[PDB]
Amino acid sequence: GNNITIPIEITQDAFHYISHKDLDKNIIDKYTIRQMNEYFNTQYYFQWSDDANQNDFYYVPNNTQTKNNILKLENDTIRYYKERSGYDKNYLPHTSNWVNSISENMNLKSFPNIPCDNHSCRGIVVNNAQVRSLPTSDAFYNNFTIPGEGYPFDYIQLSALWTGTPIMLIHMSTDKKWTLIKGQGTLGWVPTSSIANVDESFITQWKRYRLVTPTVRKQDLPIEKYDINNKILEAGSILPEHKGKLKIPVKDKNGTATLLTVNSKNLKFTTWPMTPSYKNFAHQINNYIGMPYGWGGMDFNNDCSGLLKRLFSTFGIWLPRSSFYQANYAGQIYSMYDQSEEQRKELLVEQEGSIQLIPFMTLVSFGNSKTSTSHIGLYMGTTEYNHNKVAIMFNAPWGVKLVNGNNEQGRALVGQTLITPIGIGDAFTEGLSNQDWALQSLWNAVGFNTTLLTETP
Ligand SMILES: [Cl-]
Ligand SMILES: [Cl-]
Ligand SMILES: [Cl-]
């Protein structure tokens, strides 16, 4: 082998993990969701605020522990790939100079080259966009025969941003085909055709509309008589609605956004934020199960942290983009680095802990050192599995690490969003060991943390 599939372990229905008496309840109360929704609006609209600028980028808006100089990050990214060999989108070795043409097109000597007088660089996403660390659709893969490498691990791929996302326009490539933007806690390059600037009137009118959000993962927007293409509406989008018809921003001939009314008779959406009931969380969780794992949002399929950010956005609860920032900045992190497997299971299974964990409101994160994270999921409580009570989580994992007798690595592949035991694949440890593969249990991760969400920053 090397990459070895493992079966799905537990029932793929969030309602299996919700007691009947909780069905009709909300997970958090009115006061708490109001505070979370206010925080969401501050973070989500930060690029339209007077506080934001074209030089500084925050993984968590207004938290200066997360502040970065954009030009430095751009130069760091160029340097990172100039210094490396890898493989392209067709699995062919990159030419030795392939970054040079990209660096030229980035034209950083003119940074930032999009003027911003009267806040004219405020903008919006008009087509769902794959945010890229460099302005190229070409990939950077490590050797695709190495477990954990090849597709979907294109390291240029950073995030998936949905139509409607408030952004700021920073800098345009020399060929004008790419624009460097920031929004939703992400910085990077997108096709220029996927974004548009917005004017003061656009923002004023945006704030007067009722907003809606889709209730299914993907759906097709109507193709009108003169449309050239179908458009896909993705869960997580937040868009105006008037008289029951969705409005979507489209790029006008002058490059600015204007709202277009969509014929909405067959569309599936609801007023945003969605009510944070156990029922609604269950429906939304169920809609993501089976979505392929997409590193960095590759091909509009989410990764571990992107899945959670997306789910919570439907409810007006804001998480940062990546697992480390979620674990450390969505709440007060509790590190179990100094605690044994037995102690970790005592907390998550029996709730024997110094703290109280909350199903559907606690992130569990895992990593290879005390402070780093390489996986995250949403704690969902416990279930009976193989006549044992096990802790469970909603998550998007790629695969669990395996090691053979020669200390070579492998993966027990999952590759899709699922509800899983915390110890993904632990049930298969004995069978794997008989074929000389030792599964590295998530319960034994060097870094292992819980973060409650119920405290808004
Ligand atoms: Cl920012
Ligand atoms: Cl994403
Ligand atoms: Cl487990």
Residue numbers in the entry: 21 to 477
Quoted passage from the original study:
In this work, the structural and functional characterization of PnpA, an NlpC/P60 family peptidase secreted by Photobacterium damselae subsp. piscicida (Phdp) is reported. The results show that PnpA is a PG hydrolase with a four-domain structure similar to that of Desulfovibrio vulgaris lysin (DvLysin) and specificity for the γ-d-glutamyl-meso-diaminopimelic acid bond, but with a more hydrophobic and narrower access to the catalytic center. It is also shown that PnpA is secreted into the extracellular medium by the Phdp type II secretion system and acts on the PG of Vibrio anguillarum and Vibrio vulnificus, suggesting that it may provide Phdp an advantage over bacteria competing for the same resources or a way of obtaining nutrients in nutrient-scarce environments, either inside or outside the host. PnpA is not essential for Phdp cell wall biogenesis and does not cleave Phdp PG, but it degrades the PG of V. anguillarum and V. vulnificus, two bacterial species that share the same hosts and/or environment as Phdp.
The crystal asymmetric unit contains two PnpA molecules, which are essentially identical (root mean square deviation [RMSD], of 0.5 Å for 457 aligned Cα atoms). Analysis of the intermolecular packing interfaces within the crystal lattice suggests that the molecule behaves as a monomer in solution, which is in agreement with the molecular mass estimated by size exclusion chromatography. The PnpA monomer has an overall structure similar to that of DvLysin, namely, one N-terminal “c-clip” or “N_NLPC_P60” stabilizing domain (residues N20-N133), two SH3b domains (SH3b1, residues I134-V218; SH3b2, residues D219-T295), and the C-terminal NlpC/P60 catalytic domain (residues P296-K499). As in DvLysin, the PnpA c-clip domain has an extended helical conformation which surrounds and stabilizes the SH3b1 and NlpC/P60 domains, forming a planar assembly from which the SH3b2 domain protrudes. Compared to DvLysin, the c-clip domain of PnpA harbors an extension between helices α1 and α2, thereby forming an additional two-stranded antiparallel β-sheet (β2 and β3) and a 310 helix (η4), which protrude into the catalytic groove and close one of its sides. While this topology is generally maintained in PnpA, the end of the groove opposite to the RT loop is also closed by strands β2 and β3 and the 310 helix η4, creating a narrower access to the catalytic site. In PnpA, the residues that make up the active site are C324, H395, and N415, the latter similar to the equivalent residue found in the active site of the prototypical papain, but differing from the histidine (H408) at the active site of DvLysin. In the PnpA structure, the thiol group of the catalytic cysteine is oxidized, resulting in the disruption of the characteristic C324 SD-H395 ND1 hydrogen bond and suggesting that the enzyme is in an inactive state.
